[PDB]
Amino acid sequence: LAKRIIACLDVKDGRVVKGTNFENLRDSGDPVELGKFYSEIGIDELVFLDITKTMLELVEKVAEQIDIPFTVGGGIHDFETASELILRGADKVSINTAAVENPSLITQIAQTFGSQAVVVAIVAKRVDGEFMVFTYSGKKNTGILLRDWVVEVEKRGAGEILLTSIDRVGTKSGYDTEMIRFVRPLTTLPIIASGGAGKMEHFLEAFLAGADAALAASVFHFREIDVRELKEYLKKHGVNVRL
Ligand SMILES: O=C(O)c1ccccc1NC[C@H](O)[C@H](O)[C@H](O)COP(=O)(O)O
């Protein structure tokens, strides 16, 4: 099964939170324009993340303009919101804090739209040598061990785990490959590595650690990595991608 490259677009009020400077692009803040561009250059999937209704309009336009899978995330707190996002064209929804506080939400979405529709995002940090699950964008220690939550999440019916290591996020220092390795034998689900990507070699390392997809925002936002070059590089180094 081919490894996937996934671009994460941070969105506020249905616009991309710029500093973008895509001169080739007409409007760097239009998420449909930016998403379509990524689609065309070889990105395999998109994640639209609301960092703060306008989301429903965004999903609508994205759905009819873009022909690759896309996930929506960021403050989905209930079944009704997930349902509405999926019906209006989102392929997947990502939930985190709302999954920790009501794990049945996972199962409710999976039963209604299929397991492949639910992505559970997990933010973990090291606390006294143990990986612990944090909610509220890394503000709250749930007291839940990463090793138990991963097992609960699959059991509840999740289709994928988006594995965010908050202490690598934005740093460009590499993915947290130790955490990916820790999670790999605990679950059979596809693991999406998230946070830290800085150079092509970092993607290789994440795939070697056992990720099935690698998500990045910084290196695609700051235009640092050519997607096609990245795919050729991974292929050259024995990683199965699609070209
Ligand atoms: O997804 C969240 O709510 C969240 C939570 C805690 C810490 C970061 C969070 N989101 C940030 C995104 O997941 C972030 O864009 C990705 O991890 C990719 O980051 P970079 O590629 O390092 O720029």
Side-chain angles (χ1 to χ4, degrees):
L1 245 148
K3 308 293 193 179
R4 296 167 283 137
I5 311 295
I6 302 191
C8 179
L9 296 196
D10 291 346
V11 158
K12 173 172 85 58
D13 299 322
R15 285 190 63 82
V16 185
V17 201
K18 305 148 57 141
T20 60
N21 196 346
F22 284 68
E23 177 196 355
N24 60 259
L25 275 196
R26 163 156 296 168
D27 188 10
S28 328
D30 176 23
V32 184
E33 212 182 303
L34 185 55
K36 185 157 178 45
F37 169 67
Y38 280 150
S39 160
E40 303 176 337
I41 64 184
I43 291 295
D44 305 306
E45 297 185 25
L46 304 168
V47 175
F48 289 88
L49 192 84
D50 192 300
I51 63 185
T52 61
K53 167 205 154 302
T54 82
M55 203 58 210
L56 285 176
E57 260 104 350
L58 182 149
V59 166
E60 177 170 340
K61 317 169 206 299
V62 174
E64 48 204 36
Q65 261 280 273
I66 283 132
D67 294 90
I68 60 173
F70 74 99
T71 293
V72 293
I76 301 169
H77 304 304
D78 54 48
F79 183 72
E80 203 289 317
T81 300
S83 177
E84 230 185 6
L85 289 176
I86 289 177
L87 278 217
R88 290 183 74 166
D91 295 285
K92 290 171 277 190
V93 299
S94 178
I95 56 183
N96 184 346
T97 295
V100 170
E101 298 190 323
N102 178 30
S104 288
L105 180 56
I106 297 171
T107 313
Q108 287 162 1
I109 302 170
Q111 286 177 348
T112 305
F113 305 102
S115 282
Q116 81 296 125
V118 38
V119 173
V120 175
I122 310 180
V123 173
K125 304 185 201 166
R126 299 155 172 82
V127 189
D128 296 321
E130 287 167 16
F131 290 105
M132 301 310 302
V133 182
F134 282 65
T135 45
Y136 301 99
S137 308
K139 291 168 198 174
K140 184 197 171 182
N141 183 349
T142 63
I144 299 173
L145 279 160
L146 182 62
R147 63 167 93 251
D148 290 330
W149 186 227
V150 166
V151 173
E152 186 64 51
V153 153
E154 178 176 349
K155 166 191 207 169
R156 289 299 194 169
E160 277 190 283
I161 293 180
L162 169 59
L163 191 56
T164 300
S165 182
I166 174 176
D167 303 346
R168 290 288 196 128
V169 168
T171 62
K172 283 158 192 166
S173 70
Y175 291 95
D176 192 340
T177 53
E178 184 203 344
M179 189 190 292
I180 293 160
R181 293 188 187 275
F182 177 84
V183 171
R184 184 66 279 175
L186 303 177
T187 179
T188 62
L189 301 175
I191 299 178
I192 308 178
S194 180
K199 57 195 186 78
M200 304 189 288
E201 209 254 322
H202 296 162
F203 289 79
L204 177 60
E205 290 176 356
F207 295 126
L208 293 184
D212 302 279
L215 175 158
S218 291
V219 289
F220 297 136
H221 192 221
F222 299 139
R223 270 160 63 109
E224 291 166 354
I225 291 179
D226 182 84
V227 177
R228 183 174 185 82
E229 275 196 31
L230 172 62
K231 286 189 159 178
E232 296 177 356
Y233 173 94
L234 298 168
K235 165 134 169 292
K236 182 193 191 317
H237 298 109
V239 178
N240 192 11
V241 303
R242 70 138 192 111
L243 300 115

